[PDB]
Structure 1
Amino acid sequence: MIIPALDLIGGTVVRVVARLRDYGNDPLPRLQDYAAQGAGVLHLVDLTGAKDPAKRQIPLIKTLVAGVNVPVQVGGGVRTEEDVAALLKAGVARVVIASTAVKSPDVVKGWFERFGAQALVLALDVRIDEHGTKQVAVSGWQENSGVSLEQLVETYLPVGLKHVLCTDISAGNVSLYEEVCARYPQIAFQSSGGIGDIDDIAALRGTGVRGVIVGRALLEGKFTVKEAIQCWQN
C-alpha cells in the first residue's frame, strides 16, 4: 500500500529538504483527503515532540486520528514506555520507534512484549557503505552506529517484529529493498525517501516492499494519492 505522510511542527505542515518550508496549518483536511482517495494507512512525524518529548503534540494528534477513518502510525521523540503508551491512548494505531530501537534493544524488546508487534514500527535509517553493507544510523547527520540492518532486524525477530520502515540516507537502492524483503518475508517493510515522481513508485513494485511512504511529492503536487495507489496496484 501507499502510506501518505506529513511532518508536523507546532501544528504546521512542513516539508523537509535541514531546510523547512511551510505548507500551512491545515493538517486535518489534508489527511482526510488522503484517506478519501483510498489510503489505508497514514504516517505522521511529530517534529516538536522529537525536539522535546515534553511538548509532544498529543492534543493535535488526538484530533487528527479522530478525524480520519484509517490507522495512523506516529513517530517523533519516542524514548520511553510512557511515550508509547501516551500515543496509543491518544488513538494512534502504531508507534514509530526510531533512535531508541538502535540505542536500547533490550528495552524495546520489552515494549514488543507489552504492546504487541502490531502496535510498533521500527524505523531504521540505512547508509550503504563502501563494502556494500547496510549500515544503521540513528539520523542522517550522525555517524553509523556499527550495526547492520540485518543484525538489528534479527535482534527483534524473537519478539515477533512485523513492521520495519527503512529510509536510505546514502529520484530513487531498489536492490536494497529487494534484498532485505526476500531475506525476511515474514516482515512487512516500508520504504521512505526517494519518491520524487510517479515512476519512483513503479520502480518499487515487485521488490517485495509492502508499504511506500510518500510525503513531499504529494505536497509538491507531483501526483495524487489516488494516482500513487493506481500505479502501486498495477
Structure 2
Amino acid sequence: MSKLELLPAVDVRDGQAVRLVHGESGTETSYGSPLEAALAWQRSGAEWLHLVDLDAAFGTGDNRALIAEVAQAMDIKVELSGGIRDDDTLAAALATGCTRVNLGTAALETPEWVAKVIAEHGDKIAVGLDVRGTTLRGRGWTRDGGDLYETLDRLNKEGCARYVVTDIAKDGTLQGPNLELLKNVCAATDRPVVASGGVSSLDDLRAIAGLVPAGVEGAIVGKALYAKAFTLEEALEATS
C-alpha cells in the first residue's frame, strides 16, 4: 500500500526535549519534558517514537536512566539512538525493549563492530547515514567519516537491515526534505530507507510518501511537530 510510517522524535540533552539546527551543539531550543513529549505523541496516535540521547551522541555525559524511563512508558514501537558505539551501550539500549536501535558514528569508526552487531542482532539494528553532499559525518556530526556509496555497499553486503538517512543541511531547518538524496539512496539498496530531517509541512510528508514505492518506509519528524506546524493527527491522516 501507500502508507508512510511516521516517527515523531524526542531528542534529549541535559534532561530536556530539544531540537538542533544542522545538529550543531549549542543550537538547542528546549521544549520541556522528554517524557511528557513522548506521552503526548503516543496519546495523539503515534505508532513509533524516535528517541535520541544527544549527550551520548556528543560525548557530554548521557541521559541513560531518563531514556529508559521514557521507553518504559511507551506501549508503541521505539527506535533508540545516541552514543551506541560499543557492547555496553548497545546492551543497555536493547534492554529497553526498543524495536530497533540506530548506529551512526560506529559505522564509520568501527565497521567491524557494526558488522558483528548486525550479524548477531539482525533487524534490531539500523544504521544512520548523516550526509553532507556525499560525505558521511560522525561524532555528533563534528567530523567526516567516509563516502556515501562505499559505505552503503559495505553495509549492504554485511546484511544491514535498514538505513536512516539525514541531509545535515536540512536537519532542523524546516527547509523541506532532500528528496533527491532519498531517491539516490533507494537506488543503491533494497533495504528500507527512513527519511530524517527538514520536514516542515504536510505537503512535505506527502512528497516523502510519494517515494514509498521506491523504498522509503518512514519519515522521522522533529521540529515541525514541536513548532506546531501541524498536529500529529493531521500528519497521520496525511500519510495513511
Q: TM-score, normalised by structure 1?
A: 0.87
Q: Return the alpha-carbon distance in structure 1 between the equivalents of residues 225 and 91 of structure 2.
A: 30
- 1:63 matched to which residue of 2? 69
Q: Secondary structure at the match of 2:8?
A: strand
Aligned to 1:131: none
> Does residue 1:196 correspond to 2:200, yes or no?
yes
1:157 aligns to what? 156
Number of residue pairs aligned between Structure 1 and Structure 2: 222
Distance apart, 1:97 and its partner CA: 0.7
Matched, 1:230 2:237: yes
Cα RMSD after superposing both structures: 1.8
Checking the alignment, whether the CA contact within 8 Å between 2:11 and 2:17 is kept in structure 1 is yes
Structure 2 vs 1, CA of residues 8 and 146 (structure 1 numbering), >3 Å: closer, same or farther? closer
SS of the equivalent of 1:106 reads: helix
Distance 2:222 2:233 in 1: 14
Question: What does 1:21-36 align with in structure 2 at a 5 Å threshold?
Answer: 21-24=29-32, 26-36=33-43
1:15–1:146 distance in 2 versus 1, CA, 3 Å: closer
Q: Could you say which residue in structure 2 is the equivalent of 1:101?
A: 107
Q: Deviations over 1:21-54 (max 9, x none)?
A: 2211x2223212212333221111112222337x
User: Any unmatched runs of 5+ in structure 2?
Assistant: 170-174
Identity of aligned residues (%): 31
* Alpha-carbon contact 2:8-2:220 (below 8 Å) kept: yes
Secondary structure of 1:199's partner?
Answer: helix
- 1:21 aligned partner, one-letter code: T
Residue 98 of structure 2 is aligned to residue 92 of structure 1: yes
Superposed counterparts of 1:6-17, under 5 Å: 6-17=10-21
2:172 is matched with which residue? none
Relative contact order, CA 8 A, sep 6+: which one is greater?
2
Q: Please, which moves more after superposition, 27-36 or 104-113?
A: 27-36
| Within-5 A mapping of 1:35-184 | 35-52=42-59, 55-114=61-120, 116-128=121-133, 134-138=134-138, 140-142=141-143, 144-148=144-148, 150-170=149-169, 171-172=175-176, 173-184=178-189
